[PDB]
Amino acid sequence: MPAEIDIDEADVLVLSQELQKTSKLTFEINKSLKKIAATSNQSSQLFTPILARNNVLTTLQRNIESTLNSVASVKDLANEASKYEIILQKGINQVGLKQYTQVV
Amino acid sequence: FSEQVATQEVIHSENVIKLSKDLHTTLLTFDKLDDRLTNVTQVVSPLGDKLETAIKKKQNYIQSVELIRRYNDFYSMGKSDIVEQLRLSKNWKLNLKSVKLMKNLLILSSKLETSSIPKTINTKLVIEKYSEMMENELLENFNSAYRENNFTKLNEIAIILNNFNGGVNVIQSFINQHDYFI
Amino acid sequence: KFTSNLTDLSIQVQEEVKLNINKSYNEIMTVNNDLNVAMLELKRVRANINDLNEVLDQCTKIAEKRLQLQDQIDQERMRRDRSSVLILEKFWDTELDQLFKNVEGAQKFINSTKGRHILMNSANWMELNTTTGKPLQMVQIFILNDLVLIADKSRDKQNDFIVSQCYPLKDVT
Amino acid sequence: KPFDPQINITKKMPFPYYEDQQLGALSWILDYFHGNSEGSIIQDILVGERSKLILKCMAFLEPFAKEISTAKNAPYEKGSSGMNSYTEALLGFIANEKSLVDDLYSQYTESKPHVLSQILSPLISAYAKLFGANLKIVRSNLENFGFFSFELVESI
Amino acid sequence: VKHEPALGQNDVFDLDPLSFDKWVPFLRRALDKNQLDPVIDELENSIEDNFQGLELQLLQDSQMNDKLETSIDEIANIQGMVQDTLSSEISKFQIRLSESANELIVKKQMY
């Protein structure tokens, strides 16, 4: 004002120091993809074989557990189906969530 | 003269011009930033979605078994302090006072409704006190007696005993262990 | 016998796929759990970084908005060279944020509070008893714009009302 | 259950929100009913459940907003009818409608905002109705009640 | 995972599981006699940890598995786009700090 006339180098380089503080925000950005994308690659490879074992359930044990009764007999289904007229006529709340619905 | 005003011309004109152009391109960069962030957390809905599966009946089984061996302690007969730590592992190290003397007082504090009332909490806290005295000799053996153990035997064995606190009793067992010569 | 194979291979399926895949999701989705916390708080502070895109790539683009608002002004069609406030207003509001770096440091207000635009330096000069040559008490050296605060900040750990050996710089020798 | 939503505006209380004892069995029953494909049906039923319940709680606050009780006192004259709180709990139960409805998903499902149309398009017609009511008690005379219209503007 | 801690006795607060902590220990064993008559109900609560524990164990590994596919797949593609966006940010302060010291160097020439 009365003597501050050279303010371009100091307020603008201070704004470049703020841009150096925003270069520290680029350290927060390289740090952002660094920490976040590091969690991405780390959890990604960490749980891909978890999708191979959940896939081992979800492919092999899935249709294996489906084709358990690929051939299964005639009278026994009447027997245990009648035992699901035992258990399915116990209500829902006695029986329970995947108890009832999985008997369905 | 117009050398200085040439610094005003190139510096002010190019600075304002490429300031707006580069900062507007930076605004397009921020558009890509919130783009990838929105697709990122939107892809991170499966994180919480799978993360509801923390079925803490494990906590009911370590807690139910904690009630069980707690009742083994609460028969005034919890002599299951394998000697005396148990040695080199009871959680990973000396945890006979860590998981159990803190369960002798904190499970002396475990009052369901009446649940072996304060006749039992006192002497159960005296099992916290006997295992606390042997704990004092234990971390005293860890760091105060060794005093030569630059390794984890002072460090991560008393710091394995860092569920027990009050390490200025160990500094008291440094004016009585390492400044005991002093 | 195929029902015996259902007991063996399917008890392996439910029991061993449930227990083994229970280890896969337990340990591996525990790594997805804690690493989900890592990308979770990383997503939160990443949203703070997106806020920094507003706090720096828009705030210095607001400085650029005044800049190309002045080259957009360009009102010579030479005395319109006062194209910055942040030559005065945000430069003594940044230097009055050095009256907030001052007012934080205190660093006058206490009772001078006039002009420390460049509160230009602070040092740690443990002073000397000038006669005997022995040391005196310590003193922060607060060299402001136009006044000196040679303040013993001991045991005045603030920097609110520290011991102000003070005078103005225009006759400081 | 029904209740005056003004009681959750007087006491400012948080709005009802169902929870996971249901919701695990609910979404389970849904995709369970996408193996059965009748999740559309029980979905439309559920539009029934919460839509009618908004007709219940929002049947409480039909009273103080069908009637703008300040007709021509000065003309306007108080700024103080109850179409404000009507539209307030209308939007806030639109909000917990939005969340609590659009929670329960295997994430990609088409009709989730179409569900929101199924629940709220009748309530769009409810606001259009009471919008009609205050639209005609504030009618037929500028400065009837003519400034008070601006709060209607507020509401719209 | 999330197990094998010390936990003894964190949240002292005996949790009254089937109220077996309340019934045997806290209503028939009030003054430290029992838990010996109640210790039988504690081992019975361990069998109840095998039947309650087996019951929750059935529901433990039950919700599976379709698919969380683009968790991994969008983790991959969004990780590569995260790499390219990180190139946009390092490029952003590259050209940005290049201009900052550029016209702060011509502004140092204004100094």
- The DSSP secondary structure of chain B, one letter per residue, reads -TTHHHIIIIIIIHHHHHHHHHHHHHHHHHHHHHHHHHHHHHHTHHHHHHHTT--TTHHHHHHHHHHHHHHHIIIII-----STTTTT-SSSS--TTTTTHHHHHTTTS--SSSSS-THHHHHHHHHHHHHHHHHHHHHIIIIIS-SS--STTTHHHHTTTTTS--THHHHHTTTTTTSS--
The residue with tokens 């008893």 is C129
Which of A36, A41, A47, A53 should we substitute to test contact with B (largest number of B Cβ atoms within 10 Å)? A36
The residue with tokens 């002093």 is B182
Six token digits for residue C3: 């029902």
Query: Which H helix or E strand runs over E47?
Result: helix E37-60
d(CA C59, CA C74): 22
Q: What is the DSSP letter of C133?
A: -
Q: How far is CA B36 from the centre of its chain?
A: 34
Query: Which H helix or E strand runs over C125?
Result: strand C121-128
Six token digits for residue B165: 């606190």
The residue with tokens 């501050």 is A4
| Interface residue C61 vs chain A (CB under 8 A) | no
Six token digits for residue B61: 């089984």
**Cβ contacts of B30 on chain C, cutoff 8 Å:** 50, 53-54, 57-58
- Sign of the alpha-carbon dihedral angle for E90, E96, E99, E101: negative
| Cα B56-B61-B63 angle, rounded to 5 deg | 90
Residue type, E99: E
Q: In chain B, which residues touch C (CB < 8 A)?
A: 5, 8, 12-13, 15-17, 19-20, 23-24, 26-27, 29-30, 33-34, 37, 40-41, 44, 47-48, 50-51, 53-54
| Interface residue A102 vs chain D (CB under 8 A) | no
d(CA C144, CA C168): 10
E1 vs C27: CB contact, 8 Å cut-off?
yes
Q: How many CB atoms lie within 10 A of CB B79?
A: 10
Q: Is the peptide bond before E34 cis (omega within 30 degrees of 0)?
A: yes
Helix pair angle (C60-70, A7-55), 10° resolution: 140
D32 vs A97: CB contact, 8 Å cut-off?
no
d(CA C3, CA A1): 95
Contact, B115 vs E29, CB < 8 A? Answer: yes
d(CA E50, CA E68): 32
Percent helix, strand, coil in chain A (nearest 5)?
Answer: 85, 0, 15
Contact, A26 vs E90, CB < 8 A? Answer: yes
Q: How many CB atoms lie within 10 A of CB C104?
A: 11
Six token digits for residue B128: 């916290």
Residue D85 — φ and ψ, nearest 5°? Answer: -70, -35
Contact, D68 vs D155, CB < 8 A? Answer: no
Residue B115 — φ and ψ, nearest 5°? Answer: 60, 65
Residues 6 or more apart whose CB falls under 8 angstroms from that of C56 comprise A18, A19, A21, A22, A25
Contact, E88 vs B29, CB < 8 A? Answer: yes
A33 vs E89: CB contact, 8 Å cut-off?
yes
d(CA C90, CA B47): 45
The residue with tokens 């920490």 is A35
Going from the C-alpha of B47 to that of each of A35, A43, A90, B53, E75, the distances in angstroms are: 17, 10, 37, 11, 11
Of D8, A54, D110, whose CA–CA distance to E63 is shortest?
A: A54
Solved with: cryo-EM
Six token digits for residue E81: 């786009």
* Cβ burial, residue B112 (10 Å; 0-12/13-18/19+): buried
Residue D52 — φ and ψ, nearest 5°? Answer: -65, -35
Q: Which residues pair with C147 in a beta bridge?
A: C168
Going from the C-alpha of C60 to that of each of B18, C64, C88, E11, E90, the distances in angstroms are: 13, 6, 17, 51, 17
Q: How many helices (H) and strands (E) does chain D have?
A: 7, 0
**Cβ contacts of B46 on chain D, cutoff 8 Å:** 107
Of D47, C98, E28, D19, whose CA–CA distance to A11 is shortest?
A: C98
Residue D58 — φ and ψ, nearest 5°? Answer: -80, 0
d(CA C129, CA C137): 8
Of C61, C78, E64, whose CA–CA distance to B53 is shortest?
A: E64
C39 vs A4: CB contact, 8 Å cut-off?
no
Of B101, B124, B99, whose CA–CA distance to B111 is shortest?
A: B124
Residues 6 or more apart whose CB falls under 8 angstroms from that of B79 comprise none
Q: How many helices (H) and strands (E) does chain E have?
A: 3, 0
Per-residue burial over A45-78, b if 16 or more Cβ lie within 10 Å, else e, is ebbeebbebbbbbbeebbebeeebeeeeeeeeee
Going from the C-alpha of E95 to that of each of A7, C56, C61, C145, E83, the distances in angstroms are: 23, 15, 14, 35, 18
Of A21, C14, B19, B51, whose CA–CA distance to E62 is shortest?
A: C14
Considering all CA atoms of chain C, what is the largest pairwise distance in Å, rounded to the nearest integer?
A: 108
Per-residue burial over B118-147, b if 16 or more Cβ lie within 10 Å, else e, is eebbebbbebbbebbebbbebbbbbbbbbb
Q: In chain A, which residues touch B (CB < 8 A)?
A: 8, 12, 36
d(CA E68, CA C41): 21
Q: How far off is chain C from B63, nearest CA to CA, in Å?
A: 19
Restricting to A residues 7-46, those with a Cβ less than 8 Å away from any Cβ of E are 8-9, 12-13, 15-16, 19-20, 22-23, 25-26, 29-30, 32-34, 36-37, 40-41, 43-44
Contact, B115 vs E14, CB < 8 A? Answer: yes
Six token digits for residue E68: 């969380």
Q: How far off is chain C from A53, nearest CA to CA, in Å?
A: 6
Contact, E15 vs B62, CB < 8 A? Answer: no
* Cβ burial, residue C156 (10 Å; 0-12/13-18/19+): middle
The residue with tokens 């002072």 is B154
Residues 6 or more apart whose CB falls under 8 angstroms from that of D29 comprise A101, D39, D42
